[PDB]
Every structure is written in C-alpha cells, then in structure tokens.
Design a binder for this molecule. Structure first.
Ligand SMILES: NC(=O)c1ccc(I)c([N+](=O)[O-])c1
Lengths: 200, 198
C-alpha cells in the first residue's frame, strides 16, 4: 500500500514488517527522548518501527479527509498507548479496536485511549508486565482533529452543534485546556508507529 | 477518484441522488428487492454519493483483493434500519458500536442480509410515523467467511496458532449464507437507500 514514508526501510515486497531500531541513531534517539521525558526510571529493551503498509494507507486516507474537512493540517498528535503482551500482535497487524477497550478504562467514552505522557501508559493496568516482566507501549500517530470534553457512555464523538447531529468532533479528551488523554472512536484514526518494550 | 456514473457534485462531498424508474440502475435494484419483497411497494431509490466513505471502502477492497488473491470479495446485500439512523448512515456508514443485537446472533457486528425480505421485517426497517420503511443496498467486503458465534468481537482466526490472520466476515451458514456480519469500519459502503411502504 502506497505513500509509505521515506524513513521506512525496504520491505522486500512484504506488506508488514517490524524493524528493530538501531540504538544511537537519530530515529531511535527521538523516540527514546519522548519516552524518557516522563519515564526516565524505566529501562528500554528495544524500540521497533511498525511498517504496516495497509494500516498506514488507510490512516493516511483518513488524515487527508480530516485535513480537508477541518481546513487545516493541525489534526495529528503523537501519543502513547500501553497494552498487554497478548494484544501486541493484533495491534501490530490491525491497529487499535474500540471493541476491545476495557471495561473500566472507558470513563470518557467507548473508544481507544491514548496518553499525552508515557508515564500514564506505563501503569501496570495498561502496559501489563508479562511473565518475564516485560512491558509494552506504543507511540501512536492519532488524528485528534477538533476535540471536546468527553463523558462516560459516548459511542461516537459528540456533534459540534446538537442541531446538526452528524457533523462530529474528531475526538474527545478529559480537559480541553490541558489534555492528558484523547479518545478516538473509529478504526484507522490511529497508526501504531513504534513499539517500546521496557521494564520497571 | 469518484465513479463516473455519479452526478457532478461541484466539489461537495456528499449527495443523495434520486433515480428514475426508467433507468437500468433503478430497475436492477427494484428487481433485486421485489424478488423476495413482492408485497411491498417502493416509494423511491436514491444513490448515495459519499466521497469519503467511498474512498475508505475502496482502499479496503483493494487491500482485501490483494490479500485474498482473488476478486470474489464483495457482495451486494441489504440492511434495514429505522428512519432516525438514516442521516448518520448516509454520512458515516454502519457503526458496529450502534448495531442492535440480532435475534440470532453470529457476533457483535453489523448485519447484512442476502434477501430483502429479511431486512424488510419491521424489526429492522422500522416503519416511521408516515408508514415509510428504509432499507440500504450495500457493497460489503465479505471476503473469506466462516460460521459466526455470538461472542465474536472480530471474525475468528482461520488458524488458532496464527490468531491475527482473520476471516474477513462471518455468516449464519457457510453452505447457504443468508446473513453476513462485518466487524470493521469501512468494510461496507451504503450505495442505495430504498424507501418503501406496505
Ligand atoms: N492503554 C493506555 O495507555 C490508556 C488506557 C486508559 C487511559 I484513561 C489512558 N490515559 O492516557 O488516560 C491510557
């Protein structure tokens, strides 16, 4: 699938690959710094770039649509998502699925949740340590677009005007002034870009 | 890249286009509907021109055609809905998070019927206060399918030792499918809206 970004490595005609990043090169350093800004006490085992051509293609289609609809290109944020080891193969291949969100982690709506700070996704309740103590967190491109405060029980973002109920916000947050989380409610509004495997 | 049979929308992104009973386009839909719904009468048939939904759906179709190594992945199916959901569906498609539970559930997704008679039941195409019932004709990427189960949140894996390689959809019966369930956004494009009455 097309418009692959220039920093991906050649995939030998594969449509999906996980590429372990070389420590000390610019790309690895950039992601490490984002994580260590709030997670300096954790130890990074490796960082992998997710090269999922089909997921990227569908995400970029949604990004172009949101850029057109909102009349600007300020629609993407880089956020974090902690998950358990058993969900990692699914996310790598299929992205994030609101139908899989826990349960008790839905306080601002029934969508997929993304943290501004890696430290929040680093909680064991999200990046559940596996049998060997390894924890997993994604660095995610998220199409947050135009957002509003969320609330429990939402299944889609609220409309921007209750008298035009189909023109929706793009995401919801806990606090519009100083957001710490964003929730998106549609597939392919979030692209898992890097996987960080780390320990306490 | 919008289809050439669509009306020129003057850079608008969404339009409903009323079809004329003369046309082959109208007649094929009427015939597909009447094959199992001879007791009902069509008020109108509208072509749904939704640029963004079409783009995302066509991307998914190309991906599924590549993955399955054939082009037998799409079926034209029916979906009855209440009038209050029509504005949302026209704009945003079918949302599994909004779907009612089916009387026989083969999974938690959006349901599409082979026969218009199924979608024509008042349980799905609920009559509005003016007696109007609403049924979509939908391009659905059914792909490779298996018999569903009520607990499904996505289609099951084809192979339990490769849990991420999924069937594309599920059905009530693989020998004689009458319903298909899909579990992802942009796997179904609402192409026509039939408004009909008893
Ligand atoms: N999976 C996560 O990183 C995650 C789950 C729930 C929440 I409420 C948050 N959060 O950043 O607020 C993150």
């Amino acid at each position: 699938t097309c418009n692959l970004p220039e920093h991906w490595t050649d995939m030998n005609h594969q449509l999906f690959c996980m590429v372990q990043l070389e420590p000390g090169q610019s790309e690895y350093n950039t992601i490490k710094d984002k994580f260590t800004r709030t997670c300096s006490s954790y130890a990074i085992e490796k960082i992998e770039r997710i090269q999922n051509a089909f997921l990227w293609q569908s995400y970029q289609v949604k990004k172009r649509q949101m850029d057109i609809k909102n009349d600007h290109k300020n629609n993407e944020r880089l956020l974090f998502h902690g998950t358990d080891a058993d969900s990692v193969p699914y996310v790598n291949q299929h992205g994030f699925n609101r139908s899989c969100a826990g349960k008790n982690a839905v306080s601002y709506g029934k969508g997929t949740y993304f943290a501004v700070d890696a430290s929040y996704s680093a909680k064991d309740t999200y990046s559940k340590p596996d049998s060997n103590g390894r924890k997993h967190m994604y660095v995610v491109r998220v199409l947050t677009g135009v957002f509003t405060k969320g609330r429990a029980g939402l299944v889609t973002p609220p409309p921007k005007n209750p008298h035009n109920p189909t023109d929706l916000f793009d995401s919801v947050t806990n606090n519009t002034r100083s957001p710490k989380l964003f929730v998106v409610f549609f597939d392919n509004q979030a692209y898992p870009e890097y996987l960080i495997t780390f320990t306490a």
